[PDB]
Design a protein around this ligand. Structure first.
Ligand code: HEM
Ligand SMILES: Oc1ccc(Br)cc1
Length: 137
């Protein structure tokens, strides 16, 4: 289930983080409006850009902690507030997060690994609800 999936992802976190984020960028090319430095690069080129690997891993490091601190796939309000208030998130809306989780769930369903995709769908929806509650537009 959800808790085991956190352990699965954490066991290969940089690889999973990059592959999920790439699936997001490739499913929603317009989302590069928020990632000007990732424009004009193939997947393999992005994986050789230092900030791409380091930032994507740090994003997923924190995402797994938020997932781990959740109860029944509902995140803590403190974690939602932190995600809304981060300076690096100033330009974001909940639709950005909704699309990330759609791509993440699609990736899990297409993988050979045995993920609880429905729980990640709920987690993404509940994170969006918590972000709106904490004041993200
Ligand atoms: C649960 C989901 C997310 C978590 C836990 C998270 C966490 C983080 C963290 C830890 C950083 C700092 C990275 C670093 O400085 O190395 C960061 C930066 C950033 N995040 Fe988020 N993030 C999430 C979702 C998103 C989404 C959906 C978007 C946009 C579609 C986004 C856009 C950005 C941007 C633009 C930055 C700064 C520039 C960059 O690091 O490339 N984040 N995020
Ligand atoms: O550098 C970043 C990588 C992935 C996300 Br999601 C946000 C920022």
């Amino acid at each position: 289930g959800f808790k085991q999936d956190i352990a699965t992802l954490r066991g290969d976190l940089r690889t999973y983080a990059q592959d999920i984020f790439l699936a997001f960028l490739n499913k929603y090319p317009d989302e590069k409006r928020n990632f000007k430095n990732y424009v004009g690069k193939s997947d393999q080129e992005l994986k050789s850009m230092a900030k791409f690997g380091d930032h994507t891993e740090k994003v997923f490091n924190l995402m797994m902690e938020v997932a781990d601190r959740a109860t029944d796939c509902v995140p803590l309000a403190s974690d939602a507030s932190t995600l809304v208030q981060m300076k690096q998130h100033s330009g974001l809306t909940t639709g950005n997060f909704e699309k990330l989780f759609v791509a993440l769930v699609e990736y899990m369903r297409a993988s050979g690994q045995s993920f609880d995709s429905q729980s990640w769908d709920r987690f993404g929806k509940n994170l969006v609800s918590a972000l709106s509650s904490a004041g993200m537009k």
